[PDB]
Design a protein around this ligand. Structure first.
Ligand SMILES: *[C@@H]1O[C@H](CO[C@@H]2O[C@@H](C)[C@@H](O)[C@@H](O)[C@@H]2O)[C@@H](O[C@@H]2O[C@H](CO)[C@@H](O[C@@H]3O[C@H](CO)[C@@H](O)[C@H](O)[C@@H]3O)[C@H](O)[C@H]2NC(C)=O)[C@H](O)[C@H]1NC(C)=O
Ligand SMILES: O=C(O)[C@@H]1C[C@@H](C2CCCCC2)CN1C(=O)CP(=O)(O)CCCCc1ccccc1
Ligand SMILES: *[C@@H]1O[C@H](CO)[C@@H](O[C@@H]2O[C@H](CO)[C@@H](O)[C@H](O)[C@H]2NC(C)=O)[C@H](O)[C@H]1NC(C)=O
Ligand SMILES: *[C@@H]1O[C@H](CO[C@@H]2O[C@@H](C)[C@@H](O)[C@@H](O)[C@@H]2O)[C@@H](O)[C@H](O)[C@H]1NC(C)=O
Ligand SMILES: [Ca+2]
Ligand SMILES: [Cl-]
Ligand code: NA
Ligand SMILES: [Zn+2]
Length: 604
């Protein structure tokens, strides 16, 4: 570790810890910048040389974390929990968490190499017949093909190409990750991840939220399954079984918005899928980011700095570079450089993703003056919710009209049902998936799910919560969890379930603050500087304060709450229940063992 980056001696008291934290911040920014920059260079240009550079930067970060973490314990272990400065307690708490820096050198290198190789495999995997990438090629097939056999080829091809080679690496990663965090005092890595929510009843709290939400998902599921049965027929759709996992418009069946045309009940109302209008009008990726930015500035939040426009990767490169296309938002920890890396496609759902990413950036801009250790969301679910809250306002027909994407605005109950159904395909359908991904990983980290049951337990959970089934037989040579970005890229997922609940609590509070009085689903907080001020107070707080207190200041409650989401969707919840009763549906999938047959001439 460079001499200028090493911790000196400080007095073993709170005054000394303040100075220690200031000195840490100065050097941490340098070490994080080099690590984030090396990761950027690789993720926008996947090469062996750039991977090498990123692994060397990660090794330096581990040296830094070990030196400062050990110094924090040497000086403050018996006293930091009693410091009067609550933010300093949180800073010291973070610095003394070494994570992978607990590993000896050789295992650090193995750990860093595994992360690099799992990332490369996921983002360079192809499906060949001439080869298709996940983004845009297979994504577009899953979204717009209605050939059962073509969807199956893409779904099976992708899961095989990404998942199979990842399994041996993921086993090794898990063991090293657990070894690292056991030395920070956690039973396993999942316990460390769950500890971020600082709730002794986290898992019970989540389960009670899901019990309130599940009836909405069950009714959406049955209605969509019936719509698919009318198109694909009784051979490929079992009205009492799980839905084949490749038929819902998305590789992971996690968002069902692409099958809106098959379920829309009132099709002579305005067409809420504005993708075709975006294309007709000549929208490009940069337009989508400028439109998102101007929503933020309408709230008197910050515009994107020049460094963002000059440095970001907002489209897939056409120069032959391999890149990580999965959308992400980057803080370089120098208070200057902030970037999005997204292979943006011109579609309505990508407009939502753009807003999601710019919500991340906006958080970074607002808390950039805090100490580096507090530059994060009040909890990770907060960070995932910011952009989604704005996207809820952007998606309303009145707002789409204002930005020229919808010529006619109607305000009637049929239009309400269309709108809420489309939003439910996006928000309700996701809930079981957002919940189940980390249940899978928590079991892997705890040892409940050994490598010999990776796929067995994945599909147990996929069927249990989502009510889907694989369209071809799978076995433990397959590693289908690994075919989802966040698993090989070691990004926790429960934050997205928390986000999908939280964003409706935020929306309700900001709509009230904006003076809006009508139905929650027609609120648009555009140009509400009062709502902007309330959101800004959250963003500027970072992790300086307990999330429960930040939430209470914002929405009036110190806990996650499903009631705002339930209230948003109430009209379509009742409508779907009525439709399913009238149609004689079975809610759920009691024929849980059912899988569809293979097409006759497959893959031929
Ligand atoms: C879409 O339309 C709904 C319903 O509009 C109502 O019913 C129609 C058939 C017409 O008769 C309308 O004239 C009538 O308002 C709108 O929802 C309604 O919004 C108004 C405010 O714009 C709400 O009134 C307020 O209520 C609060 C608390 O009660 C008072 O403090 C205010 O002073 C004000 O009176 C009204 O409650 C609300 N109704 C429902 C059922 O939500 C909706 O705003 C509209 N959408 C858009 C985008 O304009
Ligand atoms: O794709 C998913 O599964 C989820 C749900 C989706 C969301 C889009 C808007 C509407 C609701 C669904 C967004 N997302 C993401 O992973 C996008 P991120 O930036 O969090 C992914 C961040 C990955 C970790 C990272 C962070 C910084 C730099 C490099 C890597
Ligand atoms: C992608 O990364 C590679 C390195 O992995 C870059 O190639 C280097 O480019 C510099 C300047 O052009 C040369 O001096 C080096 O000799 C190159 N190294 C190798 C290994 O080829 C490449 O420029 C990057 N591409 C983009 C578009 O940024
Ligand atoms: C695992 O699965 C591989 C792929 O074939 C699958 O299983 C066979 C039995 C058929 O049902 C086919 O439709 C499926 O896609 C096999 O190549 C492999 O042998 C299977 N077994 C193991 C241990 O890997
Ligand atoms: Ca779409
Ligand atoms: Cl999380
Ligand atoms: Na989608
Ligand atoms: Zn995100």
């Amino acid at each position: 570790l460079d001499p200028g980056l090493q911790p000196g001696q400080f007095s073993a008291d709170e005054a000394g810890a303040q100075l220690f934290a200031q000195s840490y911040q100065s050097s941490a920014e340098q070490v994080l910048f080099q690590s984030v920059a090396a990761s950027w260079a690789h993720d926008t240009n996947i090469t062996a040389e750039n991977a090498r550079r990123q692994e060397e930067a990660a090794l330096l970060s581990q040296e830094f974390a070990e030196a400062w973490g050990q110094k924090a314990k040497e000086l403050y272990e018996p006293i930091w929990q009693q410091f009067t400065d609550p933010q300093l307690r949180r800073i010291i708490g973070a610095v003394r968490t070494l994570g992978s820096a607990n590993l000896p050198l050789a295992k650090r290198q193995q750990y860093n190499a595994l992360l690099s190789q799992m990332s490369r495999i996921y983002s360079t995997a192809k499906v060949c017949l001439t080869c298709w990438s996940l983004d845009p090629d297979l994504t577009n097939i899953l979204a717009s093909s209605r050939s059962y056999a073509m969807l199956l080829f893409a779904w099976e091809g992708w899961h095989n190409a990404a998942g199979i080679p990842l399994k041996p690496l993921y086993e090794d990663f898990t063991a090293l990750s657990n070894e690292a965090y056991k030395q920070d005092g956690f039973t396993d890595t999942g316990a460390y991840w769950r500890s971020w929510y600082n709730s002794p009843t986290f898992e019970d709290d989540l389960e009670h939220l899901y019990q309130q939400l599940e009836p909405l998902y069950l009714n959406l599921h049955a209605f969509v399954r019936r719509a698919l049965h009318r198109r694909y027929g009784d051979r490929y759709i079992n009205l009492r079984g799980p839905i084949p996992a490749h038929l819902l418009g998305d590789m992971w069946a996690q968002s069902w918005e692409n099958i809106y045309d098959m379920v829309v009940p009132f099709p002579d109302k305005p067409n809420l899928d504005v993708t075709s209008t975006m294309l007709q009008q000549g929208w490009q990726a940069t337009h989508m980011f400028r439109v998102a930015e101007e929503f933020f500035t309408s709230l008197e939040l910050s515009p994107m700095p020049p460094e963002f426009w000059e440095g970001s990767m907002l489209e897939k490169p056409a120069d032959g570079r391999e890149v990580v296309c999965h959308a992400s938002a980057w803080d370089f920890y120098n208070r200057k450089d902030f970037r999005i890396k997204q292979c943006t496609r011109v579609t309505m759902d990508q407009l939502s993703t753009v807003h999601h990413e710019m919500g991340h950036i906006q958080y970074y801009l607002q808390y950039k003056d805090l100490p580096v250790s507090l530059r994060r969301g009040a909890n990770p679910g907060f960070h995932e919710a910011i952009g989604d809250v704005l996207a809820l306002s952007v998606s309303t027909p009145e707002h789409l009209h204002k930005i020229g994407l919808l010529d006619r605005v109607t305000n009637d109950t049929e239009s309400d049902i269309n709108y809420l159904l489309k939003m439910a395909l996006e928000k309700i359908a996701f809930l079981p998936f957002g919940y189940l991904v980390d249940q899978w990983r928590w079991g892997v980290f705890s040892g409940r799910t050994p490598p010999s049951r990776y796929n067995f337990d994945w599909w147990y959970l996929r069927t249990k919560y989502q009510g889907i089934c694989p369209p071809v037989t799978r076995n433990e040579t397959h590693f289908d969890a690994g075919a989802k970005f966040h698993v090989p890229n070691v990004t926790p997922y429960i934050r997205y379930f928390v986000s999908f609940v939280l964003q409706f609590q935020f929306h309700e509070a900001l709509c009230k603050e904006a003076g809006y009085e009508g139905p929650l689903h027609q609120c648009d907080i555009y140009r509400s500087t009062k709502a902007g001020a309330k959101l800004r107070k959250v963003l500027r707080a970072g992790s300086s304060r307990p999330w429960q207190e930040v939430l209470k200041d914002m929405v009036g409650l110190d806990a996650l709450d499903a009631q705002p989401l339930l209230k948003y969707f109430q009209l379509v919840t009742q409508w779907l229940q009525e439709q399913n009763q009238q149609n004689g549906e079975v809610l759920g999938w009691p024929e849980y063992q059912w899988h569809p047959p293979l097409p006759d001439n497959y893959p031929e």
